[PDB]
Design an enzyme around this catalytic site. Structure first.
Site: not given
Ligand SMILES: [Cl-]
Ligand SMILES: [Cl-]
Lengths: 362, 362
Positions: A72-73, A154, A182, A202-204, A240, A327
């Site tokens: 995702a980055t 997140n 998220q 993102s998969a993870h 690839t 904060c």
């Protein structure tokens, strides 16, 4: 030893099913999908299935693209840089509007853009822990090229008013991008309802492998490649194909979608139980709104006694959690489908004991 | 069925050892290396080992960086775009010199750069099938920001005079980048001897997984991130580490290095045997020099009868090879550590029969 994992907004366990699905692509089906011969061709059906799964997961249409990326980055970078090339340099639209809540992958990119002379306005978070859904409107200077809001935060778990930013984007004629990292597996995601031009994931973060992601790109919307080479992914993203990861990611997405009710009803319940248990302790209060949050996340702050210390203590007892700026940093506990009531109970006990120990030290 | 795989310059089988090494990172060690707690920390040693292996593979020093990327395409993009940002826009050095032989990941990027107003001069290949090692000198206009030459050609197998381009680069004070994708595991690679500032590689060309690569960056040399987010890889390349792939890649690199003699002596021998067998057939000749080639590659052209047809025929008999442009495309056959003499013999037989069949048709 039995460890307890409460850091799911940081990364997630790969689902055994995902692992299983990936395995034959690490072993015998190792051919390059671009090759003409039987290896490459052999890979096609699986890839197609994966892509279908992905599409279903975010309610994308046949007409749209869901481009496979390395993370995702990557996606974020592609969106921002692409828009700079297309819409900022070449069409003079030298303004981007985002939030201060956004993941560093966006914020850092924005900073870099600014250093080239892009104007970027970062919407300040309110006391509710959200963006008004109107600050955007108040800041769309027509010279705005892009609006970028994360679907869910997140750190806090807080859901932002996507869909209502989509309208404010359609009305204003401005490109809309939502980093949804998220959101997947946590709440329904619908790119149609969102009127997104661009969506990241993102998969993870939903039981796929680290090292793979998606960018949804709307039909007819153009974005200059971040990876030039134009051989793969309809020219949009060269390199690839990561076949194994693709397959795994597809499976993961499917599983995530399937478990939406479970996430809501059961994971959410667990989270609530945890939260309630915690709050029955001196000067410990949840950071942010408690209603517009994904089911899996609680961020909690202990009077005086800092977050890092608490985290360390937890680790010492085999319980893994993260910080979250608030904060004094706060304590971020993020569940998954794989936590149990027993585990939650244990955590509660351990948390209380740890607090008391730290209290004693004080 | 028994298939024969001769397409290694297109992608390679993952080594069983590599697979084995990756497995526990798909299963129980799934924590995010950035996390503070036991999951993240648990990942460290393995990662370190991988990195060490990588470093050893290309004779990089402690002082240097070998940055993990998602692929060599990625690396290429990073190099070119980075140099444009640093050296082209900001230091007026608005010239890049490359070859026409370069992989599309470079060439396409260069094209894009040009479209922004960069001048790029693409060195023409000679009859020997090489760059003179002097065309570069003849074209370093001082305003040259970067020189980019592939270490070995993917189509022909031909090795270019790196090391002698490194000198011409050091003497001239110009940044030197070598895409080394097809060099790893094939011939020794030494970034010191090469005087490279930048080197690219991709795992899947030496029995690692698809979907991971490296960029070597020399000490003190700067390159603006292609992935901004600055959390991983000393700020240079953001995105959660692909732990499994990293580990696998390290192992693969090690194995590649170990098998250099084998590649030379045995794989090379096999290739030679194949080539000689083929050449004893009407009007079939190897395309390019036959002396400055990596041990594993032969590119051969059949009088009249085109390459695609031949490839198709081969596929029909379970033998996988690729095309290679030559001027009628030619036939690219690229071995690995895993081919056997028997397989080669079979290929020869099959090739001859196929030729005769096509001949008959003619
Ligand atoms: Cl770009
Ligand atoms: Cl860049």
């Amino acid at each position: 030893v039995q460890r307890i994992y409460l850091d799911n907004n940081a990364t997630t366990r790969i689902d055994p099913k995902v692992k299983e699905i990936m395995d034959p692509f690490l072993r015998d089906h190792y051919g390059n999908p671009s090759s003409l011969h039987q290896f490459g061709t052999e890979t096609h059906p699986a890839i197609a299935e994966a892509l279908d799964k992905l599409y279903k997961g975010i309610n994308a249409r046949d007409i749209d693209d869901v481009i496979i990326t390395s993370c995702a980055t990557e996606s974020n970078n592609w969106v921002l840089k692409g828009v700079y090339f297309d819409e900022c340099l070449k069409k003079g639209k030298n303004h981007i509007v985002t939030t201060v809540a956004e993941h560093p992958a966006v914020r850092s990119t924005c900073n870099f853009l600014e250093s080239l002379g892009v104007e970027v306005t970062y919407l300040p978070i309110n006391e509710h822990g959200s963006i008004t859904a109107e600050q955007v409107r108040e800041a769309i200077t027509e010279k705005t090229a892009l609006v970028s809001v994360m679907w869910a935060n997140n750190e806090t778990g807080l859901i932002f008013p996507i869909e209502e930013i989509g309208a404010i984007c359609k009305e204003k004629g401005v490109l809309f991008h939502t980093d949804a990292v998220q959101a997947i597996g946590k709440i329904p995601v619908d790119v149609l309802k969102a009127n997104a031009d661009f969506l990241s994931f993102s998969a993870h973060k939903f039981h796929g492998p680290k090292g793979i992601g998606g960018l949804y790109i709307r039909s007819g919307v153009g974005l200059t490649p971040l990876f030039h080479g134009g051989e793969h992914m309809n020219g949009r993203r060269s390199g690839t194909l990561n076949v194994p990861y693709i397959v795994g990611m597809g499976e993961a997405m499917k599983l995530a979608v399937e478990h939406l009710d479970y996430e809501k009803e059961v994971v959410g319940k667990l989270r609530d139980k945890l939260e309630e248990a915690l709050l029955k302790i001196p000067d410990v209060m949840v950071v942010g709104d408690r209603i517009h949050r994904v089911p899996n996340t609680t961020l909690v702050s202990v009077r005086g006694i800092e977050g890092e210390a608490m985290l360390w203590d937890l680790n010492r007892s085999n319980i893994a959690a993260s910080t979250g700026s608030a904060c004094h940093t706060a304590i971020r506990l993020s569940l998954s489908r794989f936590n149990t009531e027993a585990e939650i109970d244990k955590t509660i006990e351990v948390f209380s004991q740890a607090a008391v120990r730290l209290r004693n030290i004080s």
